[PDB]
């Protein structure tokens, strides 16, 4: 069972705003609940 | 002795209830009922932006319905009363009855955005115009299925003496082109429960349904319950008819590995790579008026042996070596039909082009973990020809750097030849 | 268990009567009588005078009679002989003994000026030339019947295993081309469920009335349906298909005015362009008797029609569009057919030329009526369509006049547009 | 439907624990059915190419294509394929395709170029000459499976589609089918024996497999061989009964059909069919395998009846003439097609095809003169229009001489005239 999964793995190796709203979300939970 | 029933694609029998749809697809169902005498045609759109539903009361009580996004066909088989009523409704339902000797019955009618289709028990073929206006009419092998899209029209010629048949051909607005003609059909009859045969009463031939594919490649589904599609339709020298999914097999996969009975896949349409089709999980294998929400299952090249399923389960665990083959199978078959398409049709989608590059790009990737496994079997020499197949001289680096992870260095020689000669 | 019984074009079963008839080309009926251990053999001919109706008495009771021109190919399929007898009596009435395995009943045999073929039950396809010199012989499937003209074989065959098909072909001056290849035919077969009729089937099982090439050499069949198939565009075989051009049973219930007659009955002899030469036998028998009957020579009919409707309008009565309708699709069909054999066939009569034109101007003129049709229905998108198919601007000017005094300026318009077009093309 | 497996010219047990899972040129396999595994003995009429080894078989493999690359043993039931190279370096690898329920191996056709797998379902399947697989489809229930240089030609029954043959060759790009599941003429069948071997052999073709040049040939329930020539043309291509094994037995019988007598054709040898004569109840052969009696080639043209009402069956000389002419013609064509496709792969074809010139146009003389004996003018005028080459219409005019008769002397003058100068 020759692991090729790095093999195939790096064959296939060749500031989102809806990332920013999930920052805010978790940064507002976090001030919600923070003391 | 066989008999020659009225059919539409995916149609359902009024069974104990008052209610059957007379037909289903992509661009919708049609559903009647019975109501004191008069029957309730009721025509539902799947895209309610492209139409409206609308629902007539059907005096004549038309059995036959062909849905396409420009109108309707219904038609009567006993009666020979057909009516048209386009979807736009700039024009009137334009009707007519054609011409039924004794015993002659509509055995199933195909709408064609210009013209118009009539089959018969007697097999007498009938062309009508968008408007009625007759084209001619022609006796050929009774058919018994008229699937047609766009201006495709798939017809499903059997005989009691011909035997099955289908004839393939692209009427279009000009330069009517007949791909096939009554070449035999390779699908297997139903064996001769009470649902079942009561479905072969209302389809004696037993198809499940007939379309053609998301790009136009017809489709079949007999009550094998086997989707089965004419690879290379579009060339008749290469055309070969490839079973692309296998229900039960699916079916006995998902479950567990359980030999369940009552799910039913209705096949109501293939999309590319995957099968729109209703899973009837009740005895009457066809759906019920309360249509549900139609299910999607990607296509599934038949290279499972149950046997080694089941001895590996003793959730089914699939061996990656014939994983990857299926994996490479049905990449290889798609990307053939792909470029096929993409070639002679060009693409409603421009994704296409990527789609066909991520395919190939799994295909050799596929070769790869085949590659890595006939390795680990120092088959050097299966190996290499595992590599010949490779698309990709990038995906030869990445072979042959798994042959040095082989330790396979006649291997490894043998790719670096491979890389030179494609380098040539 | 099929009986693959010979059968020859137009042939007639004995029944009780002794007298009976081999095939009934329009050149001659080749009529027979079984007396005593012999059967007196009467070539007639509906041509006496170029060939004279020589009778001669035949101790070998060739069953399968193929007549011609050139000559007659009288032949006996139990004994695998072949007495081909020329009508010229420059070639003399060669003779052959077929080699016929045990079994081997010879289903049809074909005779042609190029050359003789003979059909074997156990499908090994047999063909000599004439004055009997071997041409070939190979193995197809089990030979139904044998209709050919010229270089031109129209060869039907069913199996209990391979079911109806036929092979057409034309003799290729490198090999005998294929046209279709035990192609399916789409042609009626007969259903026990009469008894003249099922004497018939006893004596022709497939209920084939008889196989004649048409004026034009297409394949044309006839059977008991009671409805001719020709296979137009035959010369292409991918876009060949056949069309019941006529139907002998609604013709005859029309000609009878809505009296159904059962005692009528039809018998093919051949197709002189449009007219179908054929018997119409009135008896019990199906088949003409001894007395051979006037050949009736009827037009081919598209089957449009349905027989409630002339009915309720009611020798039957045809609602003027209707009969447009079918008058349109005759003209297509026959007119596609006479530029088919003048340019791939080539022109033969000559006449051809003005037949094709006055059957584009009968197409034309059923369009007109029909246009008018639509624009009494004001339907302009339907007459649209008419005006359209025309095949003449001539008939585009008279179907303006029609919308202009059927009020369709806007039809009228587009009917401008459509002349712009075509002309400016 | 039994739809019984069948391998390319193979044996029934015949209520015994020998018999043979396939007879070719390479060999034949005989197999002992040794308690429940199976010592098949690879028998090789040439065993200096490869050892016949008696290896035991444990699945008792139904099927078993037999290709001097290696020799293929497929199971129905069970659906293992065990390929055994016949090269030593190839190592025997084995392979189980998924089947249907019912589903069953019916034949298999490995080449060495390629590797191809049939089922009663008609789920055509395919792998390479160390089982990777090549393509899968479905098709018409395949019956017979015979390929030799990836010419994959099929035959396939249905109770529907009835009766069919897919010829096909596996171009590089893909396999271009010659005659794609088209209806085979072969006739089928409606004693003991018979019921043995169709029991065994339902589909009643004794065998499937190509010509010395690889055109494709069979032989029927009828005992005859038939090859489909042509067949590189679909328009053109044809299937000829170019033997009559009754006939050409009956012939060497004097006049007596001996039912005992039995031919087992595994091959072709172009003008001499390649096969064994068992002579026994039992058609196939029997363990003592009869050594393989190459039939020559005979046109069935010979009339029964009147052969032996000219009485080895004394035959006359123009109905020899005849079977000459024929089997001269259909031979030299077959010639051609395969030359012009598959060319001088003997080195000697294109003196047989001249061979075979010159022996047609000697039957064409020896009909001339009879058709001159006859008097007739256009008879023996169509035979000088038969003729090739010059010598022939020299033959033919001084023939029409000998037997008097001028006019042909100025036809076959004016022939001659009209072919040397152009």
Redesign the interface.
């Known amino acids: ?4 999964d790095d ?2 793995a ?3 190796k ?1 500031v989102s705003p809806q990332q920013d709203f999930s920052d805010l979300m978790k940064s507002w939970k976090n001030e919600r609940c923070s003391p | 002795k066989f008999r020659y029933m009225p059919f539409s694609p995916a149609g359902t029998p009024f069974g104990f209830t008052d209610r059957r749809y007379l037909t289903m697809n992509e661009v919708g169902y049609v559903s009647t009922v019975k109501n004191s005498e008069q029957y309730s045609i009721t025509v539902s759109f799947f895209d309610v932006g492209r139409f409206r539903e609308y629902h007539f009361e059907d005096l004549f009580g038309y059995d036959l319905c062909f849905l396409n996004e420009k109108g309707t066909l219904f038609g009567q088989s006993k009666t ?1 009363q057909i009516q048209y009523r386009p979807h736009d409704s700039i ?2 339902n ?1 009707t007519k ?5 004794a015993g002659e019955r509509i055995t199933s009618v195909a709408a064609t955005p210009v013209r118009v289709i009539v089959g018969t028990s ?3 073929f009938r062309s009508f ?6 084209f ?6 009774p058919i018994v299925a008229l699937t047609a899209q766009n201006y495709r029209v798939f017809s499903v ?3 009691q ?5 289908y004839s393939l051909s692209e009427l279009g607005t000009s330069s ?1 082109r ?1 791909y096939k ?4 059909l ?4 139903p064996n001769i429960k009470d649902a079942n045969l009561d479905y072969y009463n209302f389809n004696p031939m037993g198809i499940k349904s007939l379309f053609f594919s998301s790009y136009g490649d017809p489709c079949i589904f007999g009550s094998d319950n ?1 989707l ?1 599609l004419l ?2 339709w579009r060339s008749p ?2 055309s ?4 692309i999914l ?1 229900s039960n097999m699916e079916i006995w996969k998902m479950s567990g590995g359980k030999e369940t009975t009552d799910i039913h896949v209705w096949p109501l349409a293939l999309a590319y790579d995957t099968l729109n089709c209703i899973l009837v999980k009740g005895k009457h294998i066809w759906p019920e008026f309360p249509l549900p929400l139609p299910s999607e299952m990607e296509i599934r ?8 399923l089941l001895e590996e389960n003793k959730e089914i665990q699939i061996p990656v070596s014939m994983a990857a ?1 299926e994996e ?2 049905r990449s290889k078959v798609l990307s053939e039909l792909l470029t096929d398409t993409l070639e002679n049709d060009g693409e409603m989608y421009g994704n296409e082009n990527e789609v066909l590059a991520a395919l190939n790009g799994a295909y050799d ?1 596929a070769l ?3 590659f ?1 496994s006939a ?2 079997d120092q ?1 050097v ?2 190996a290499l ?2 590599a010949h197949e490779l698309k990709q001289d ?2 030869l ?2 072979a042959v ?2 042959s040095e ?2 330790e396979l260095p006649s291997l490894v020689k043998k790719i670096n030849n491979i890389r030179e000669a494609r380098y040539e």
């Open positions: 069972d020759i692991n090729i093999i195939l790096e064959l296939d060749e | 020979g024009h009137s334009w009855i054609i011409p039924l000797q007697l097999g007498y115009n968008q408007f009625g206006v007759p001619a009419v022609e006796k050929t092998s010629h059997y005989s003496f011909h035997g099955l048949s009517k007949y003609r009554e070449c035999p390779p699908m297997s009859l086997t089965l690879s290379k020298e290469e070969k008819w490839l079973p296998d090249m038949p290279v499972f042996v149950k046997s080694k083959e490479y199978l990737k790869l973990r085949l890595a390795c680990s088959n020499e299966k020809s595992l990038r995906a680096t990445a750097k798994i992870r082989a």
